[PDB]
């Protein structure tokens, strides 16, 4: 506790003699050494950081079409046709 040092939780269970042993996920600290005895440590760990999983997008079936935007594919076909007809326009033009 603040200013009265009353160990809440699981610590006062063995400090104030309420329980007999604490087999639990309990980290050995320094200030806990002063109030209760311990065993040798059995599982090492540390401060981890957990954040969300930020949602990778998968490729599609047409993933080869991706390095050119949707419009230009439609735009190039338009340009493809009109190029060809003008060639065919000047192709047959009454050779005299």
């Amino acid at each position: 506790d603040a200013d009265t040092k009353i160990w809440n939780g699981m610590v006062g269970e063995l400090v104030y003699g309420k329980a007999d042993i604490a087999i639990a996920p309990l980290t050995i600290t320094l200030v806990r050494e002063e109030v209760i005895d311990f065993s040798k440590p059995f599982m090492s760990l540390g401060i981890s950081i957990m954040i969300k999983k930020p949602q990778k997008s998968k490729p599609g079936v047409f993933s080869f079409l991706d390095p050119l935007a949707y419009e230009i594919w439609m735009c190039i076909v338009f340009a493809y046709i009109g190029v060809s007809v003008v060639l065919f326009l000047v192709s047959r033009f009454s050779p005299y």
Partner: protein
């Protein structure tokens, strides 16, 4: 001839020249150095309290940086994160001619 030693040894000698070692796999177990006294000495609690400060203050890590990582000497710890050369050689090519 293989040889068995500890993880802190295996990382340290791999940092030595000429880097001719290699650690393979993981470890086998989870051991730990600890300071020992004669059994029943008075020194037990004042030592074992004093260890917990430096671990909590991380001074051991600063020392662990000192005696392993501030003396990263042999090579690929440094040169492994650098750039490369160019100009393709015939030994890369010679099977194509075959």
């Amino acid at each position: 001839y293989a040889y068995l030693l500890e993880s802190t040894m295996n990382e340290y000698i791999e940092q030595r020249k000429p880097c001719d070692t290699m650690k393979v796999g993981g470890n086998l177990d989870s051991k730990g150095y600890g300071i020992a006294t004669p059994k029943g000495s008075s020194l037990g609690t004042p030592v074992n309290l004093a260890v917990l400060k430096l671990s909590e203050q991380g001074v051991l890590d600063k020392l662990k940086n000192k005696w392993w990582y501030d003396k990263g000497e042999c090579g690929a710890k440094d040169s492994g994160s650098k750039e490369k050369t160019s100009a393709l050689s015939l030994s890369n090519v010679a099977g194509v001619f075959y």
